[PDB]
Design a binder for this molecule. Structure first.
Ligand SMILES: [Zn+2]
Length: 323
């Protein structure tokens, strides 16, 4: 039996030089993302709501206008909830569907349900409207390079529905979309016609973005089997910084620090991690101060920090895909 599922263990990045880094920093526009990808998502969008629908259409429309050969799938399913049976819909955007391996970027597009309080509405700006916009901006910004993909390795984006609990977190009330998708992918032969390999074996790495957008985030290196990739994020941040390609940024206050975090954090990566998928969890610790508060809004977002992370992530993806 082919040993292709092991290729991910030996995969190395094709590192960009100074000139290329300058080009990537120049190619991303934080103001464009702000107006075209983020603001339309800053609305109430808990599962089943009109906003969930509007968000899903926004995300799909923005991917569909790109030149790259994105194949969009809406994975809709039912699940029991504290409010009875309900419908959910994950959004999966895939380049080269039959491609055996894919680097996967992900986040959740639902917003935690909260009844309006004193005319305030919860829109989860950092949680996770920004991660959503960041993935859209990356697809747009790297569009020309991704188009060239039209190593049997390509890219995939997942926007999970129902990451949030309807009440407070519990094993059964939360991670609706990811628990469902992880199970579906684990039982789907891949590539097509395969005898004993699944879509999960095809996942080179799950890079999950969550709670991004607040000032001074510090991301810990959570897992040893993705530690070398965390290292690459550190190196990229360091080099972009040294080249003067980051804004209001210092090494003392770097985002990717030299520290681990032993505990467990409940999030969409769990169902994948427990089935063996390598995970690079881009969630900060501590969480943003506005976490699950009506203040997790646009006003409290740190623009230059988001801009800096767009450059780091875009460089990471290009290097991973050898583009
Ligand atoms: Zn949340």
């Amino acid at each position: 039996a082919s040993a292709w599922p092991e290729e991910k263990n030996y995969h190395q990045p094709a590192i960009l030089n100074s000139s290329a880094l300058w080009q990537i920093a120049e190619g991303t526009s934080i103001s464009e993302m702000w107006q075209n990808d983020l603001q339309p998502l800053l609305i109430e969008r808990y599962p089943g709501s009109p906003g969930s629908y509007a968000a899903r259409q926004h995300i799909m429309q923005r991917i569909q206008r790109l030149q790259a050969d994105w194949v969009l799938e809406i994975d809709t399913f039912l699940s029991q909830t504290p409010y009875g049976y309900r419908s959910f819909s994950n959004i999966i955007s895939t380049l080269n569907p039959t491609a055996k391996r894919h680097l996967v970027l992900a986040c959740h597009y639902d917003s935690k349900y909260f009844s309006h309080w004193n005319n305030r509405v919860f829109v989860g700006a950092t949680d996770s409207a920004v991660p959503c916009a960041m993935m859209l901006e990356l697809a747009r910004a790297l569009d020309k390079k991704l188009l060239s993909l039209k190593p049997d390795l390509s890219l995939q984006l997942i926007f999970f529905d129902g990451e949030e609990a309807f009440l407070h977190w519990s094993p059964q009330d939360s991670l609706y979309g990811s628990r469902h998708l992880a199970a579906k992918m684990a039982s789907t032969p891949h590539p097509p016609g395969a005898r004993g390999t699944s879509q999960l074996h095809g996942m080179d790495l799950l890079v999950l973005l969550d709670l991004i957008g607040a000032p001074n985030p510090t991301f810990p290196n959570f897992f040893p089997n993705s530690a070398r990739w965390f290292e690459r994020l550190q190196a990229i941040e360091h080099e972009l910084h040294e080249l003067g390609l980051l804004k209001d940024h210092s090494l003392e206050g770097r985002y990717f620090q030299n520290y681990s975090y032993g505990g467990v954090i409940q999030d969409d990566h769990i169902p994948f991690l427990r089935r063996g998928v390598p995970v690079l969890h881009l969630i900060p610790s501590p969480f943003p101060e506005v976490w699950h508060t009506m203040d997790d809004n646009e006003e409290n977002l740190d623009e230059s920090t988001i801009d800096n992370l767009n450059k780091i992530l875009q460089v990471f993806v290009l290097e991973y895909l050898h583009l």
